[PDB]
Amino acid sequence: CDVEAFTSNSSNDVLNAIKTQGASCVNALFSAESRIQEAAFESGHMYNIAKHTTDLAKAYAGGGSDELEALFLYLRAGYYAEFYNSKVSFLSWVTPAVKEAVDAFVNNANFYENSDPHGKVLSEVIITMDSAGLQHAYLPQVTQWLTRWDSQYAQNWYMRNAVNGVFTILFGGQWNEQFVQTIGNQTELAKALGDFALRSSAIGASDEFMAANAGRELGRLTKYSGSASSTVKSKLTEIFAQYEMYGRGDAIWLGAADTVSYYADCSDYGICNFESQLKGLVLSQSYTCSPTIRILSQNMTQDQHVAACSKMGYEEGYFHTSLETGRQPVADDYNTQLQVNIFDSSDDYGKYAGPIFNISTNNGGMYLEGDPATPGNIPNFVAYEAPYANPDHFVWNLEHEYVHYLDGRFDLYGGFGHPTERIVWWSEGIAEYVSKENDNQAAIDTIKDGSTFTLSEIFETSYDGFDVDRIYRWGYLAVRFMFERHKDDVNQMLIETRQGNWANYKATINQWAILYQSEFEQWQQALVLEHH
């Protein structure tokens, strides 16, 4: 690969680079520095490359095309950059040329070929329909792909990728005025979409994820009006009758229930309050560690329950001794027993945890402190098992996330959002320090790799941009340094954080950043020399 080849002023130069380097090299342009994206995605290049792609797509004879894969990938990479990069903007004559190229591939007699090579280029064409804002233009093709899909297509990884792209089109169409005004009249699309979701052969198969996406997008169609409405309702009713919320086809049931509940009247479908019933079905095990920790789980062994409870119990004692809490909670906090809710896998978390706890699941777990002062507030850590999680409990992120419960109840006044000063360095640093103690090679490694942060910088840390090195490793280093070298200062700070005097907390740590920077550097030196 040579990403600089895509920066030439000459469109023919850029075309030749796309052809010679191929899709795996074009990948770099999605993440390239702005100078590269600005040069590669000039309006003139997008137009000229689209015009070349049109002729090549017309000539396509099936069996895949490395060049067409790379060309369509480039075009939709341009729309990706245009969306995110303020210095990439397209003139109005760009998108019609791109639409012409997509048309040429769609109208080619080979468009519905079933093969992995064809799927590689077809995938990029289907995604371009969304990236280029053409969701209103190919609904007959979306319908055809939905009804043509079968077990033969489903054998091929890249055909699964490609046809799964039609759910991206339907989702992205929400922002397309022409799509919004026509989709509700597409009775044949609605029938095909529902019948795709109802295809029993998808359950447990390589394409189950597509059937679940179909159910979710079908439920989303209830936000529109038009002649297709009764078909959408009828197909959703059939989904809710054919499958169930916990059991066979529940990925499809729950996918449809998610968007129906959000955009429609749950009472029209008989699914109001399914989330409370779902919780009892999925989190069917209950294991009380102690008055301060109870586990609800989907499918854990007795040995895992015992190990989770003892590991958390050890952290609990180490926390209370280290933070000198006297086991006295902050005021206005009645989160007396943490509920630890553990699903059987990341996939189960993604399916069931969303509706049960009203959370997003595109993550590795989350702790919901809630409103600690409100009667009936429940503190919920929501998690899953994973094969590469820590023995002997195998609960992902358990040891770190558990400390957030303790810190929130005994150190930090108020709910999660109460602080009016930045406290990420403390929250994440204390979770790392209590859970890992002095075993943290990654924190040693970031001192000696050419990039360090001052105490001043660490205290300003936020979650914006999610700098894991800064948040987790340098938060740990600052916290550990303060406990080892300035414990009385930490106790002074906790007087303020425990009652929500955030301005006082900031003034306290401001003094640390002025006074202690050179000692912090010496303490880092000692850590590095110990490693050697």
Partner: peptide
């Protein structure tokens, strides 16, 4: 919120 697609997953 709308986000354009980045990379599609390759077969392992």
């Amino acid at each position: 919120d709308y986000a354009p697609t980045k990379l599609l997953p390759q077969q392992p």
